């Protein structure tokens, strides 16, 4: 039993809700919140900008030190950093950004990072400003993640579409 509330169950291990991931994180304080990161950990907009704003820019300060030490992430890769006031940990995962021409096949590699964590609160990778089809992203999630994932979808119209079209 965990504290996630109001989710629709899609599969044995995948759950979905129309929610603001920032508000969901502040209420649940999950062990892991996933950020929709880029390779530079520049949290300017989308999910990343919202998560970082909610940390009063502490996420960005920590991220800048990470990059200065380690260099950029790989597309499809991840790193574990602090969850600040939102979660114990933040798993920064880089999905491909279609608006940069990145290979959508890397989306599966991106979701594989979730399997290193037993339970996660996450957005749909490569959705939103990353330019991928969220219905495809949900399919890859379901077919790749084996650990327990709670997906927060900000847009109510999109949430209803994802549910209605789910196979
Ligand atoms: C690869 S992405 O990060 O750019 N994907 C997207 O942006 C998708 C999904 N986004 C979110 N999903 C869940 N919770 C969210 N809180 C937010 C707060 C914001 F100020 C902006 C977006 C979100 C958001 C919504 C917009 O479209």
Swiss-Prot record:
Inhibited in vitro by GRL-0617. This is Papain-like protease nsp3. Residues 1-167 form the Macro domain. Signal peptide: none annotated. It comes from the Viruses. The chain holds residues 1025 to 1191 of 7096 of the full protein. It is found in: Host endoplasmic reticulum membrane. Changing residue 164 to L: In strain: Gamma/P.1. It catalyses: Thiol-dependent hydrolysis of ester, thioester, amide, peptide and isopeptide bonds formed by the C-terminal Gly of ubiquitin (a 76-residue protein attached to proteins as an intracellular targeting signal). Responsible for the cleavages located at the N-terminus of the replicase polyprotein. Participates together with nsp4 in the assembly of virally-induced cytoplasmic double-membrane vesicles necessary for viral replication. Antagonizes innate immune induction of type I interferon by blocking the phosphorylation, dimerization and subsequent nuclear translocation of host IRF3. Also prevents host NF-kappa-B signaling. In addition, PL-PRO possesses a deubiquitinating/deISGylating activity and processes both 'Lys-48'- and 'Lys-63'-linked polyubiquitin chains from cellular substrates. May form homohexamers. Interacts with N protein. It is a multi-pass membrane protein.
